């Protein structure tokens, strides 16, 4: 018979077949190129926002409140072909999310603002 | 040995928290000496006792054979 060296019995080790991957239960059509439009909603044109454009090379936008800083950087590159070196975010008292996006020195925030239409 | 906090202890060199002597950083110099002497003397007493017991048995069996040869 088998020999046991511990004072209590534990469950033996047996073969386990891994689970299989089922067909996906979601069949709605989603597009990869549409995603960036959801992240960035629209820019702001308040007095504080306008001062930052000329003096800090910074833009101001209203973004999706569930987005993070990393995604906002990627969307900015994909929509306006500019590089952002720093993103600061806050959630306004009215529930919306605002982002101060500082552009790299290679680009001019004022030039980008004119292309957008501010 | 220095007195260092959590982050300071992790980044410091190994010399600052130990000593080249055996049990360095755990026991003091006098405690190491006590253990070294104790290990030698206690072990030696066991050897003396062990050899004493075997010879007493050894000399006892020789007498039995001598008594056996005398009778026979």
């Amino acid at each position: 018979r088998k020999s046991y060296t511990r004072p209590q019995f534990r469950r033996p080790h047996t073969y386990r077949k891994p689970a299989m991957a089922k067909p996906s239960n979601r069949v709605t059509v989603e597009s990869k190129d549409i995603a960036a439009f959801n992240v960035i909603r629209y820019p702001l044109t308040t007095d504080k926002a306008m001062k930052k454009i000329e003096e800090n090379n910074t833009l101001t936008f209203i973004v999706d409140s569930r987005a993070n800083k990393t995604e906002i950087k990627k969307a900015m590159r994909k929509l306006y072909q500019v590089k952002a070196v720093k993103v600061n975010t806050l959630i306004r008292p009215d529930g919306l999310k605002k982002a101060y996006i500082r552009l790299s020195a290679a680009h001019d925030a004022l030039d980008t603002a004119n292309k957008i239409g501010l | 040995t220095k007195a260092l906090r959590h982050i300071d202890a992790r980044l410091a060199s190994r010399h600052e928290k130990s000593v080249s002597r055996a049990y360095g950083g755990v026991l003091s110099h006098d405690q190491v000496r006590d253990r070294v002497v104790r290990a030698f003397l206690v072990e030696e007493q066991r050897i003396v006792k062990q050899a004493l017991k075997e010879h007493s048995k050894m000399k006892l069996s020789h007498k039995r054979t001598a008594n056996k040869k005398k009778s026979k």
């Binding site: 046991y4 511990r6 004072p7 209590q8 | -």
Partner: protein, 226 residues
């Protein structure tokens, strides 16, 4: 340079090897219960009706009977389908299997020999069959393990098997088997009906009683006159 370095395994001393702990470990509940049930069944007092199933047939006779049963085993599904197709374009002689059909054969007195497994649970399924066979004066044997009967006939288990007809090539074998079976079971009816069972002490209790008797020996010698 090689030398021997023996280890001291006395009380205290060096750390010992891992010794077998099977007899003292905590087993699962079903293991413990299936051992305690056998112990209790041995310890209690068993009525004759249950006790008769403990005394079984001899190994050689059991092997011969199982060989004959396997020789006369029933047909399989493929064989039956092939035979039915051939006749389309009665089953051969075989043993009788199944509780209902075996009981009918015994009651109608068509069977020449009956074999009964000794480990059927619930036991009420076959507890009366030896009595029925004795009343009808039919040779019967009680053998070990329904699994062996099931293997002989081609299934997983079987409670009882009846032999009714056998060819001339095995008539003599059947007669010898009937003689042996009658010697073991049918001739000893009075003993079977009167004999009780159980009441077995354990090895520890038996040894304790023996040592007690040995110790308390001769202490009453002085009370004997002369």
């Amino acid at each position: 340079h090689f030398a021997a370095r023996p280890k001291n395994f006395g009380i205290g001393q060096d750390v010992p090897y891992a010794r077998d702990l099977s007899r003292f470990m905590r087993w699962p509940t079903f293991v413990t219960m299936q051992r305690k049930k056998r112990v209790l069944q041995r310890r209690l007092k068993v009525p004759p009706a249950l006790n008769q199933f403990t005394k079984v047939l001899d190994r050689a006779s059991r092997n011969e009977a199982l060989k004959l049963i396997k020789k006369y085993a029933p047909e399989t599904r493929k064989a039956r389908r092939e035979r039915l197709q051939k006749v389309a374009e009665k089953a051969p002689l075989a043993v009788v299997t199944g509780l209902q059909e075996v009981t009918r054969a015994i009651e109608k007195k068509q069977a020449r020999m009956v074999v009964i497994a000794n480990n059927v649970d619930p036991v009420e399924l076959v507890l009366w069959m030896p009595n029925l066979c004795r009343a009808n004066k039919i040779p019967y044997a009680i053998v070990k393990d329904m699994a062996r009967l099931g293997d002989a006939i081609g299934r997983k288990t079987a409670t009882c098997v009846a032999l009714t007809d056998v060819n001339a090539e095995d008539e003599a074998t059947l007669k010898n088997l009937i003689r042996s079976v009658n010697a073991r079971f049918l001739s000893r009816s009075d003993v079977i009906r009167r004999q009780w069972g159980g009441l077995q002490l354990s090895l520890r209790s038996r040894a304790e009683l023996r040592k007690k008797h040995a110790r308390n020996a001769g202490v009453d010698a002085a009370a004997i006159i002369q």
